[PDB]
Nucleic acid binder design. Structure first.
Ligand SMILES: [Mg+2]
Lengths: 380, 245, 1341
RNA sequence: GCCGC
DNA sequence: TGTGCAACAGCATGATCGCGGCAAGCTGATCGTGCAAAAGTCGTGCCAGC
């Protein structure tokens, strides 16, 4: 290693019998319930506040309906008239705009708490937020005529709109778990692309299991011999770990030899690898190989980190033989990305171009591929 | 008995869970083998091993050697959790870490009265944060608790004025780490000072067995009408002048 | 000559009085010698991995007709130096290459071979290398490895103090320790029977181990006891005479010699009667038959008539048995001594204890006893006994163990086998038996002749061996299944175990730890540190009072001052300044030989036993010009004692008084006027001082500051110094003198001075040059000084003007009153450097990118970020400012219409990517100092990174082109000389480049030989320089092979200044510590008649009860030194002529009472006198050695020469009122240190934070925002007061009441102040834990 | 490992 | 006068060994299986909006 990162901060409970214990953390709802406790509320008001705080998502939005909140209470004199009042009180909390019904509600609540002398407060308070929101989503060229205002003033009214916070309530959120990957199966580039299995720790577990179980057995302080108590348990542990490691290594080897085309040259050279294809390769059932490849990750210099991605069973009735949709999806992404400023990319036109390239795909099949991670560039 | 998390998404089982897993595995294997009409020797071996696993779970290190984990130290059993200095009785209960607590080095204050002590103003505004929030919201400076929290975070001058009133008549307790006697902790009226060290009256140093060559004390706040009165009536320095020995 | 260039600049006035026979050693050679004997190869197997390789190899598989032949090894060149390793966070190591050959032996032909494959060397593991200072950079740290003091292998005899059975019975035991293997014990029970404890098992009698060596009881009886012959012929029954043994006995009957009475019956036994009997030559004499009744037969006499015989050895005889033996024809009967005067009944009783009389019986008995499992089959026991002892692999005494074993048994030979033989156990048992009988004595276990030292090289060798043995095991198996095609690399090279063991030892070990980097002296003390703990050592609680005591053999080996205080007292020690280690591993100290009545300058090193044997004189004993003692009777140490002896009686003399003081203690002036326990505190506190903004020399020293400063490796020392050519704040270039040079390529010296950098304790290490320009430099001179160093002298504090008086209660107890002038002048101000790092790793959502743009963050936080998104170099950051901008991707594949709307109004990401950026932690104020972006190979290089690369390569070419320029200048000079020799155009030739087209050809010889060779050398030099520059450039820009997950690493360094404050802790070097109580304005401090105020006020009450008299003497001597400096400064102000200034300097230097230091300004240059005077303008740096230094009279005459009061006390005035203090107040100069204890690092306050998941109780400790623990004694105090409500509020809410906490917080915010207490969660956890047992516990109503 | 006892 | 009973010494085992604070320092998971049963998904074709 040319350079090594510094060790990440870790801790463990010392001078405490239940080792490592734990640590409490603050969340969005925990921080909202803290504010509920410190504001003057009645018993029923506190109950409603807890009910609507429980329904706040991580983004801080209100996933459940107000009418559903009223239904949940199931109490007389708890109609939506007072549920709305408690809801507004909660919305005016430290993450301003939290617990909002929708995007319009966030912006309307956020704009309420301002100097009231903002240069374009009233220009964007309701005219842009509470009305013609879809126009602001679009270019809003006609919005200038709709609001009877010049484009110049709107050019900064939308600037203020963007200055307003998009999704309030995810700022207080911490985010300590980075969900990093150890990449149990590193693979490298050689004259034939060899692959290896790291983090096995089987010899490490073997040595520790020896020094503990076989160590106690070999220690002649105890009468007799502990040849069956733990000596024939460490062997089972080692055998289980080695069997799992061998199965994983063999399956990953089959995947690599089949998908070497992906790693070589361009990435989008995936074969539609079905579970049976590797099942016959290892002479083993597909279900056992499948369970194995569910969350195992490989480290690639350029390739994606995920065994399941290679399966792509997408014969797609391609012209010569078969193909894979994931490669077809990458092709569609690249084609749509590199187009004219108009960028038609019509699902009929895109399908015709793909068929000319040799991929006989239906017109609607390309549309589902595009809608998976993109939007039509004014193709309508 | 939660397992410990690891880098990425991996989880490591604590020593309490290892004993439970061993017991469950042995019990399941014995139960399955008992239905197969296995020879009595194997059944006896399995029964003895299950008995040993249960004994290790209840009190590891008894009747034989002690089961150890990945490293060569015994696994903590159920009995290793309720006994000893690190046990709940001596650690969690009979002694506890507490909120509203501080600590720093002590210096001498010769200008101090006997009932007074010098408190760093940076320790206060943290030891007395809820009181400051209450006074801020009571005087109309802050309407919501969020506003008061933001105002305290910025430490404006009016916050310092409010803090002084909070410290106007609220006794505080100072304690030195080896408390051989009750004179180990004494009550004082805090005096706000600019600095980072607690100023201690020279006449209580002998009772504290304290000197100004690196000693530190802890600070505790009695946030109760009863606790404040007890500090003023029982634990103040001007109260305990004669040694109760 | 007399003084070096660096020492002529400022000469310390030594007070000496005793010449030095030898100088002081490097003090870091130990570590260097050990590691050199480790990595370095040896023609024999004496030292180096070579010994381990020969111990393991050759290895052959069982019945494999296959061998591994080993031939040599080689260590590779490291890919990074120490600096790059330390900045990158990697280990500084070297690749290990070993050449080995595989030979296949013929199966058909016995002892014949068919194949022999000698392929090239193979690579296994990486060996960490120690730096020139004796440190191991592993994972970018320092990690010194501490030496260990353990018991040497051998044989030892003890007596357990004779208080075990409470009967007053002393129990003697013997013990054998090998280097590796099982142990052996011999013990005595209160019944006096031999017991053997093998490997700390159950007690077993010595007869079975005796018989397991094929020893029969009869044979054993003869060896165990001397036999006496009883002859019964013709009913006479005569007795053989042994007068020597017959010392104490009662004559049961008349004893007659040759028919004449010699000793009557019951006649008193007298040494005279025995002598008279021995004088008369007497043959065998008759005795009463009844006496033999108590005798015990030794042999087993056989009856010639029938096979029946009395073989019952260890048994007595009966009267009827006499008739049986007479009938059988037994004329002579053999019986053992049976005498108890000095000898005693042993072995035979143990024989009666156990009846096993066969080798097989003993073997099966020991196999069953030591291994209680399956019974053996005549083979398990036979194998086990060989495995226990005398096995080539399982058991081995070292060469030290064999030497000690032979020495303890008084054997002429020193060398021997590594395993014990049959005779060794016999000799040990015989010696143990004799010890009880009276001959011999028990040895001391704490004697330094029984305690050995292991350094880093030996431990590294041991760990390498375990990796070898581990790898060798796996190697054996694959030889069985290995075809001829198989090659060594394919013969289970197994580089994994060797490297794993090596890194395990070097990284995670008890004796491996970070080196203290507060000061150079602290690093030196850590490097020279001896520990009794560790793997082979003793645990803390297992130690006792006698182990931690000062032993008389500690004299010149370990200082009796420097040691930790609380738990580790007496278990961690330091080498004395002159101590050295034996090849076996025993501490030595040097002494001067004494021949006749005159000492000789020859020096011998003696171990504890060697010193004890001779009478050693004291260092402070007066001598004559010829070397003869001035006083007849002299003080000496003979055998752990001290008394008066004649000068001739002495055989050796102490080389120096310091011989008994550690290097750290050697730095305490007037140490002998300080209490030893108190001095301990001063020596310990000297290593906690932090270097300040500017180093200041001690005005009062001991003369050891230069050795510590130079030997620590902190300064820059001229390795081959010539003349200084270029100087800068970061570089020094020296033009080496031509008197010594390496032929070819000439050469210059380049030194890259270290700038501000983090230390292990977060302090700053910086180097500043001491030379100006064109200055001559000799070998070993100091060019630049490091942290806390001044002109090559250790300078770890500052010189304060101190008054000793009480000042209005502000120095009560140990408080220190400091003036504001100290704060204004930035004395005691330190720089602290911190390191923060940010790493980007690929995630399931996707790669983690580092960018300047950040969602949901205002422009204000991005003001200080670069285009990449990193704080600008030199930015000042506080609070929670953003250092590196990093965003992690989120997981989302269902585009909700609102999400599409959010993406429509806002950016494409719509702030979906979360914010995980490096922000400054609260309480941390720092200025951007250095950014260290590292990039993965293949990924796009960071925009900031290319700038770092450009700076790197620019510096590389800048420091590389100098040698090329010098070489090309030399070549041009040679060409110019050649063209001058013929066809010289002078300035015309010099104007045209390329030597004016090489000056055409001129003569044929010049064109063919001179010009052609010059052009060839020019081209070769240019090509070589270009290739070297290209190689350096290619090395600079390379992809960083990082961890598979890791994508990019960015490191940020912050620098802060620590202002001096009252809550801070200060100390002198006499054990006088204290914290600051007040910073006083300048007009309030006491001042003298000239209006000069003092800087510090110290309490006089701290001196007399501490016995810190060195404080006062140091203060007086500092006053004298500053007075002399003041006189010199006054003379320099008025620009007096050099002659009288030189005269006054000379008068000050030669003052004293016969001091050894002789300095004359006569041989001093006139300019050098001026420079020296300006250097000592502040004060004269006096030096008083440890036990041989200045006296009161000398201090007084120095005070007189400085025109100061002789008492050391002056008149002082109150700064607030102007009144004169009644009594005179002592005023002078003292060296004060600032320790690493600060209120900022020790001020914490919490109201409410996070809590542990278990017990629902707040966390503990700062850096975690914890609460103070209210322990058991605090609760006892609250109970004693009667404060029930305070205790309930501490025990319940505000601690573990989950609902009570929130209710109390709400009440306090509402201004109610009502507890409303509930039940703690810890008690619920306890109830659940108890119920999880079989016990039902409940709360009744 | 260190600090205050 | 030989015999049975109660008191005692020697040995093995268990339990305990001060209180606060700051650093630096770190553990993994296993079957497997084939098999249908179930759920789930992909390529393809629908009708409604522009
Ligand atoms: Mg103290």
């Amino acid at each position: 290693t040319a350079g090594t990162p510094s060790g990440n901060g870790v801790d463990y409970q010392d001078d405490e019998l239940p080792v490592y214990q734990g640590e409490t953390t603050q969340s969005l709802q925990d921080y909202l319930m803290w504010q509920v406790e410190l504001t003057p509320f009645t018993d029923t008001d506190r109950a409603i506040a807890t009910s609507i705080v429980d329904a706040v998502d991580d983004t801080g939005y209100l996933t459940i309906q107000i009418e559903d909140i009223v239904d949940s209470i199931g109490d007389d004199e708890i109609g939506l008239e007072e549920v709305e009042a408690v809801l507004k009180r909660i919305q005016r909390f430290d993450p301003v705009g939290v617990a909002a019904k929708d995007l319009r509600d966030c912006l309307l609540i956020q704009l309420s708490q301002f100097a009231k002398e903002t240069p374009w407060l009233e220009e964007a308070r309701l005219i842009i937020s509470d009305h013609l929101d879809l126009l602001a989503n679009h270019d809003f060229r006609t919005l200038m005529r709709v609001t009877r205002l010049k484009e110049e003033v709107l050019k900064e009214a939308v600037n203020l709109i963007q200055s307003l916070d998009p999704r309030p309530g995810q700022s207080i959120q911490t985010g300590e778990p980075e969900y990093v990957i150890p990449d149990v199966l590193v693979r490298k580039v050689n004259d034939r692309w060899v692959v290896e299995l790291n983090s096995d720790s089987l010899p490490r577990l073997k040595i520790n299991q020896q020094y503990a179980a076989m160590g106690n057995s070999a220690r002649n302080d105890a009468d007799g011999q502990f040849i069956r108590s733990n000596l024939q348990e460490a062997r089972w542990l080692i055998k289980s770990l080695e069997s799992a490691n061998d199965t994983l290594l063999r399956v990953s080897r089959c995947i690599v030899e089949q998908q070497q085309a992906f790693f070589e040259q361009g990435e989008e050279y995936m074969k539609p690898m079905v579970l049976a294809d590797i099942a016959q390769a290892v002479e083993m059932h597909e279900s056992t190989i499948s369970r194995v490849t569910t969350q195992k990750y490989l480290h690639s210099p350029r390739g994606i980190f995920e065994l399941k991605y290679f399966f792509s069973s997408h014969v797609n009735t391609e012209g010569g033989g078969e193909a894979s949709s994931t490669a077809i999806r990458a092709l569609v992404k690249k084609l749509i990305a590199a187009e004219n400023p108009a960028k038609p990319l019509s699902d009929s036109k895109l399908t015709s171009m793909l068929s000319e390239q040799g991929i006989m795909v239906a017109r609607r099949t390309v549309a589902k591929y595009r809608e998976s991670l993109s939007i039509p560039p004014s193709n309508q | 008995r939660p397992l410990v998390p690891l880098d990425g998404g991996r989880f490591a089982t604590s020593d309490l869970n290892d004993l439970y897993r061993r017991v469950i595995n042995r019990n399941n294997r014995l139960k399955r083998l008992l239905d197969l009409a296995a020879p009595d020797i194997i059944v006896r071996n399995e029964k003895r091993m299950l008995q040993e696993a249960v004994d290790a779970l209840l009190d590891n290190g008894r009747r034989g050697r002690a089961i150890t984990g990945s490293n060569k130290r015994p696994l903590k059993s159920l009995a290793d959790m309720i006994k000893g200095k690190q046990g709940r009785f001596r650690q969690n209960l009979l002694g506890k870490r507490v909120d509203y607590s501080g600590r720093s080095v002590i210096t001498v204050g010769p200008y101090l009265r006997l009932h007074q002590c010098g408190l760093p103003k940076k320790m206060a505004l943290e030891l007395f944060k809820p009181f400051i929030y209450g006074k801020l919201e009571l005087r109309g400076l802050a309407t919501t608790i969020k506003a008061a929290k933001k105002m305290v975070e910025r430490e404006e001058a009016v916050v310092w004025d409010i803090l002084d009133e909070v410290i106007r008549e609220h006794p505080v307790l100072l304690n030195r780490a080896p408390t051989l006697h009750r004179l180990g902790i004494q009550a004082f009226e805090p005096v706000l000072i600019e600095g980072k060290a607690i100023q201690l009256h020279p006449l209580v140093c002998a009772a504290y067995n304290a000197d100004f060559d690196g000693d530190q004390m802890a600070v505790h706040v009695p946030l109760t009408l009863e606790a404040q009165l007890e500090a003023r009536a029982l634990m103040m320095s001007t109260n305990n002048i004669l040694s109760p020995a | 000559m007399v003084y070096s260039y660096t020492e002529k600049k400022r000469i310390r006035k030594d007070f000496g009085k005793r010449p030095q026979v030898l100088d002081v050693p490097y003090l870091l050679s130990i570590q260097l010698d050990s590691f050199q004997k480790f990595i370095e190869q040896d023609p024999e197997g004496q030292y180096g991995l070579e010994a381990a390789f020969r111990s393991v190899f050759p290895i052959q598989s069982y019945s494999g007709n296959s061998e591994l032949q080993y031939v040599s090894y080689r260590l590779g060149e490291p890919v990074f130096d120490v600096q790059e390793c330390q900045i990158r966070g990697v280990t500084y190591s070297a690749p290990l290459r070993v050449k080995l050959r595989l030979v296949i032996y013929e199966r058909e032909a016995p002892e014949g071979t068919v194949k022999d494959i000698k392929e090239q060397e193979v690579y296994m593991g990486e060996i960490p290398l120690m730096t020139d200072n004796g440190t191991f950079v592993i994972n970018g740290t320092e990690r010194v490895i501490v030496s260990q003091l353990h018991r040497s292998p051998g044989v030892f005899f003890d007596s357990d103090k004779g208080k075990t059975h409470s009967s007053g019975k002393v129990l003697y035991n013997a013990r054998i320790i090998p280097y590796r293997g099982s142990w052996l014990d011999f013990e005595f029970d209160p019944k006096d029977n031999l017991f053997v404890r093998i490997d700390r098992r159950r007690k077993l009698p010595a007869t079975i181990i005796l018989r397991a060596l094929n020893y029969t009881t009869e044979q054993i009886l003869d060896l165990f006891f001397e036999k006496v012959i009883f002859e019964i012929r013709d009913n006479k029954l005569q007795m053989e005479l042994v007068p020597e043994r017959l010392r104490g006995e009662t004559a049961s009957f008349d004893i007659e010699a040759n028919g004449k009475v010699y000793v009557e019956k019951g006649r008193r036994i007298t040494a005279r009667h025995i002598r008279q009997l021995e004088k008369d030559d007497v043959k065998l004499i008759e005795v009463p038959v009844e006496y033999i009744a108590g005798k015990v037969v030794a042999k087993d006499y056989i009856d010639e008539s029938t096979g029946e015989l009395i073989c019952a050895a260890n048994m007595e005889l009966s009267l009827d048995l006499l008739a049986k033996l007479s009938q059988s024809g037994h004329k002579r009967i053999e019986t053992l001594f049976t005498n108890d005067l000095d000898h005693g009944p042993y072995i035979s009783e143990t024989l009666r204890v156990d009846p096993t009389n066969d080798r097989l019986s003993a073997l099966v008995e020991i196999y069953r006893m030591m291994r209680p499992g399956e019974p053996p089959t005549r083979e398990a026991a036979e194998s086990l006994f060989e495995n226990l002892f005398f096995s080539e692999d399982r058991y081995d005494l070292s060469a030290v163990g064999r030497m000690k074993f032979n020495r303890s048994l008084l054997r002429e030979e020193i060398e021997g086998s590594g395993i014990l033989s049959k005779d060794d156990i016999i000799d040990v048992m015989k010696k143990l038996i004799d010890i009880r009988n009276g001959k011999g004595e028990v040895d001391d276990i704490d004697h330094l002749g029984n305690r050995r030292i292991r350094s880093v090289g030996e431990m590294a060798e041991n760990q390498f061996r375990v990796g070898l043995v581990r790898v060798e095991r796996a190697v054996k198996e694959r030889l069985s299944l290995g075809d001829l095609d198989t090659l060594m690399p394919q013969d289970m090279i197994n580089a994994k175990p060797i490297s794993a063991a090596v890194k395990e030892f070097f990284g995670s070990s008890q004796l491996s730890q970070f080196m203290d980097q507060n000061n150079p002296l602290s690093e030196i003390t850590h490097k020279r540190r001896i520990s009794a703990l560790g793997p082979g050592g003793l645990t803390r609680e297992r130690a006792g009072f006698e182990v931690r005591d000062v032993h008389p053999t500690h004299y010149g080996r370990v200082c009796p001052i420097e040691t930790p205080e609380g738990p580790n007292i007496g278990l961690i020690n330091s080498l004395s300044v002159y101590a050295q280690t034996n090849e076996y591993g025993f501490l030595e100290t040097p002494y001067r030989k004494v021949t006749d009545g005159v000492v000789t300058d020859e020096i011998h090193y003696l171990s504890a036993i060697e010193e004890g044997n001779y009478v050693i004189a004291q260092a402070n004993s007066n001598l004559d010009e010829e070397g003869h003692f001035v006083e007849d009777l002299v003080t000496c140490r003979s055998k752990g004692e001290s008394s008066l002896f004649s000068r001739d009686q002495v055989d050796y003399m102490d080389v120096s008084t310091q011989q008994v003081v550690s290097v750290g203690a050697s730095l305490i002036p007037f140490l002998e006027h300080d209490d030893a326990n108190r001095a301990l505190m001063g020596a310990n506190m000297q290593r906690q001082a932090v270097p300040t903004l500017r180093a200041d020399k001690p005005l009062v020293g001991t003369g050891m500051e230069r050795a510590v400063a130079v030997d620590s490796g902190v300064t820059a020392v001229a390795k081959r110094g010539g003349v200084v050519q270029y100087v800068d704040a970061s570089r020094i270039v020296i033009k080496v003198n031509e008197d010594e040079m390496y032929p070819g390529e000439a050469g210059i010296d380049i030194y890259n001075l270290t700038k501000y950098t983090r230390s292990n304790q977060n302090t700053c290490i910086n180097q500043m040059p001491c030379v100006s320009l064109g200055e001559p430099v000799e070998r070993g001179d100091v060019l630049a000084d490091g942290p806390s160093t001044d002109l090559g002298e250790l300078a770890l504090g500052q010189n304060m003007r101190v008054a000793f008086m009480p000042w209005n209660g502000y120095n009560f107890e140990d408080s220190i009153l400091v003036s504001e002038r100290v704060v204004q002048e930035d004395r005691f101000t330190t720089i602290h450097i911190q390191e923060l790092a940010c790493v980007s790793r690929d995630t399931k959502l996707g790669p983690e990118e580092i960018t300047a743009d950040i969602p949901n963050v205002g422009e204000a936080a991005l003001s200080k970020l670069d285009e990449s998104g990193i704080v600008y170099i030199g930015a000042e950051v506080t609070g929670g400012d953003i250092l590196v901008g990093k965003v992690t991707p989120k997981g989302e594949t269902q585009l909700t219409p609102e999400e599409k709307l959010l993406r429509a109004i806002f950016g494409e990401k719509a702030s979906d990517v979360k914010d995980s950026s490096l922000r400054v932690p609260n309480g941390v104020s720092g200025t951007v100092i250095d950014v260290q972006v590292f990039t993965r190979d293949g990924v796009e290089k960071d925009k900031r990174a290319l700038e770092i690369e450009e700076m790197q390569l620019k510096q590389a070419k800048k420091d590389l082109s100098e040698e090329l320029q010098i070489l090309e200048a030399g070549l041009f000079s040679r060409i110019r000389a050649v063209l001058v020799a013929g066809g010289v155009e002078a300035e015309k030739l010099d104007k045209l480049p390329r030597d004016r087209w090489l000056e055409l050809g001129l003569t044929d010889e010049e064109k063919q030989n001179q010009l052609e060779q010059l052009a060839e050398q020019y081209d070769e030099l240019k090509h070589e320089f270009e290739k070297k520059l290209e190689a350096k450039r290619r090395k600079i820009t390379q992809g960083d092979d990082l961890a598979p997950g890791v994508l990019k690493i960015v490191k940020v360094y912050l620098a802060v200044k620590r202002r001096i404050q009252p809550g801070d802790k200060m100390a002198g070097r006499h054990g006088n510590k204290g914290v600051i109580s007040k910073i006083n304005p300048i007009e309030d401090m006491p001042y003298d008649e000239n209006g000069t105020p003092v800087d510090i006020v110290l309490n006089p009450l701290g001196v007399p009860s501490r016995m810190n008299i060195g404080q006062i003497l140091e203060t007086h001597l500092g006053m004298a030194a500053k007075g002399i400096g003041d006189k010199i400064n006054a003379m320099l102000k008025q620009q007096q002529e050099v002659a009288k200034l030189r005269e006054f300097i000379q008068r000050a230097y030669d003052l004293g009472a016969d001091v050894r230091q002789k300095v004359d300004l006569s041989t001093f240059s006139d300019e050098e006198v001026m420079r020296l005077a300006e250097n000592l303008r502040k004060g004269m740096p006096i030096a008083t050695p440890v036990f041989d230094g200045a006296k009161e009279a000398e201090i007084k005459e120095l005070l007189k020469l400085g025109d100061l009061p002789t008492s050391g006390q002056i008149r002082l005035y109150d700064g607030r009122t102007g009144e004169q203090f009644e009594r005179p107040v002592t005023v002078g100069y003292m060296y004060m240190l600032k320790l690493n204890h600060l209120v900022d690092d020790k001020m914490h306050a919490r109201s409410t934070g996070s809590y542990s998941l278990v017990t629902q109780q707040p966390l503990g400790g700062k850096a975690q925002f914890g609460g103070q623990r209210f322990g058991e004694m605090e609760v006892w105090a609250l109970e004693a007061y009667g404060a029930a409500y305070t205790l309930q509020e501490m025990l319940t809410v505000k601690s573990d009441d989950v609902n009570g906490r929130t209710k109390m917080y709400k009440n306090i915010v509402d201004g109610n102040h009502q507890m409303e207490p509930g039940m703690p969660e810890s008690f619920n956890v306890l109830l659940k834990e108890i119920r999880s047992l079989g016990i039902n516990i409940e709360l009744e109503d």
